[PDB]
Design a protein around this ligand. Structure first.
Ligand SMILES: O=C(CCCCCCC(=O)Nc1ccccc1)NO
Ligand SMILES: [Zn+2]
Length: 257
């Protein structure tokens, strides 16, 4: 099955998922001098005050924090989006070393990790229908750099010991995702895809310009998770990122000059 190893990693995915070589694949390098400022872009509207987190899960390739998406509790609107997108889950991609781990890059610079807040367009009724549509998902991407600790991340860090191996889950209620946001909501946006199989081309990407800082100790704890299930040989969950893909016939737009 697919993964991030030498024998099943990103360079092999096209054999099972031919869309890997498609026209709107993610992630991409953001060339800041080629991005086009678009004055028609609206500020993002992030309404997370009523978010209800439920559970944290190690799915074998990352850990997901899942939210109740049965009502318009935590929504994303505005920016390049039409309509209302509900938050369903967030997860991270990270590296084995501080100088790699993000999926998107900025002028070829890699960050230590990248946070993806995943939202789906409510006009399609459920997440499984949304992923079949070119405007089905909106993913907020936030870069992590190593520096000062992020207090709002510590509750996530402290539960990771309980979900070390694939398939483990733990109750994770009352987590407020507003503690993961940077001060500024300036962003780049482009049409893209999921960065894991099935690589569907259903994502409006919104990548925030301002990184958040996390401490070395916080990211070190991400690197203690395991790709494997319990009782299987230990494989550390590191470098679960896909490299940048060709931009092809797409323009990256910026909300700021
Ligand atoms: O791809 C991304 C960003 C969006 C991830 C969305 C959640 C992953 C997911 O649910 N994938 C999936 C979709 C349809 C069918 C099977 C898996 N990051 O890796
Ligand atoms: Zn992701």
């Amino acid at each position: 099955h697919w993964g991030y190893g030498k024998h099943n990693g990103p360079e092999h995915w096209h054999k099972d998922f031919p869309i890997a070589k498609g026209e709107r694949q993610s992630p991409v390098d953001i060339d800041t001098h080629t991005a086009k400022y678009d004055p028609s872009l609206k500020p993002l509207s992030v309404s997370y005050d009523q978010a209800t987190s439920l559970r944290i899960l190690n799915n074998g390739h990352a850990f997901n924090v899942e939210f109740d998406d049965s009502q318009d509790k935590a929504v994303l609107k505005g920016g390049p989006l039409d309509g209302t997108y509900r938050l369903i889950q967030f997860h991270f991609h990270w590296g084995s070393l501080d100088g790699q781990g993000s999926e998107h890059t900025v002028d070829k610079k890699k960050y230590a990790a990248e946070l993806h807040l995943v939202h789906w367009n409510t006009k399609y009724g459920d997440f499984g229908k949304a992923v079949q549509q070119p405007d089905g998902l909106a993913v907020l991407g936030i870069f992590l750099k190593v520096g000062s600790a992020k207090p709002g991340l510590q509750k996530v860090v402290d539960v990771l010991d309980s979900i070390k191996t694939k398939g483990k889950s733990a109750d994770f209620t009352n987590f407020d995702p507003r503690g993961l946001l940077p001060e500024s909501l300036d962003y780049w946006t482009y049409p893209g895809s999921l960065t894991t199989p099935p690589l569907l081309e259903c994502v409006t990407w919104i990548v925030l310009k301002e990184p958040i800082s996390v401490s070395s100790e916080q990211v070190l704890k991400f690197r203690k998770l395991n790709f494997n299930g319990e009782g299987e040989p230990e494989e550390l969950m590191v470098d679960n990122w896909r490299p940048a893909q060709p931009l092809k016939n797409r323009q990256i737009k910026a909300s700021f000059k």
